[PDB]
Amino acid sequence: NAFEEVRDFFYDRNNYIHDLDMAAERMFTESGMRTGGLDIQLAELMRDRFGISVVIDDNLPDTAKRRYHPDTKVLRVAHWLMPGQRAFQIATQLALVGQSDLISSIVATDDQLSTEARGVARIGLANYFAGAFLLPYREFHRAAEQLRYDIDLLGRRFGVGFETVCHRLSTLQRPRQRGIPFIFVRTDKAGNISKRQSATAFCPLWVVHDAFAQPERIVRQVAQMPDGRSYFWVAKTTAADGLGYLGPHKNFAVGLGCDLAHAHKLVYSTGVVLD
Ligand SMILES: [Ca+2]
Ligand SMILES: [Ca+2]
Ligand SMILES: [Cl-]
Ligand SMILES: [Cl-]
Ligand code: NA
Ligand code: NA
């Protein structure tokens, strides 16, 4: 299972890829980027630095979110995407073309990966870079602390979707500047579940599946995990639209869980309990 190999690859690295995370943040800062309208700014960077022309287009083959034309250096980006997802696509291609050697060197540190897993890892690392470019580490970490980890306000502040914020929160393991350690859980209506752990090594799946009963509303609960500790969980369905990295082909629920001992920093931790 290639996806299982890549899950271990990120697990072994605490879900944080330092060289790519730092490369994204340095490129964001050195190019004078500012949060807001990053899709236009990235298009300028792509032209200036690589001679790649970004164009917004419809009728992309297979309703893809992007199509790169390497022979004339044109990146087509789907018109139905919101600015945050347009930026995400462009930054993903920026990693593939401008961080290719770095990505290859990172993948190579896992001696066991199969070929299929190396290809999955390459795309995952380019996606990782895109998240770390749209949400540069120190700025995003500072914003998460000052907004008390409010996923919706973070999304509105940076112009990105709910699962994009959640995934980034689950990567904040930079040494000496960690965020709250989260378990990230994504599931579809049929129970197909992707779980990512930062601190643990393990499950009450209703902590995220419960979101499907109150669509587009945050669902919060406290549940014990297999270690005997209680976790505070926040979950929501993702709208099938132009924002967030999850495909609009079906509906997902996404959630974060943190040790109850970290939950006081969450805006979510005030409220009344019931069965
Ligand atoms: Ca391992
Ligand atoms: Ca969405
Ligand atoms: Cl992709
Ligand atoms: Cl997004
Ligand atoms: Na290194
Ligand atoms: Na870990």
Author numbering: 153 to 354, 363 to 435
Question: What do the authors say?
Answer:
Upregulation of the methylcitrate cycle (MCC) is required to assimilate and detoxify propionyl-CoA, a cholesterol degradation product. The transcription of key genes prpC and prpD in MCC is activated by MtPrpR, a member of a family of prokaryotic transcription factors whose structures and modes of action have not been clearly defined. We show that MtPrpR has a novel overall structure and directly binds to CoA or short-chain acyl-CoA derivatives to form a homotetramer that covers the binding cavity and locks CoA tightly inside the protein. The regulation of this process involves a [4Fe4S] cluster located close to the CoA-binding cavity on a neighboring chain.
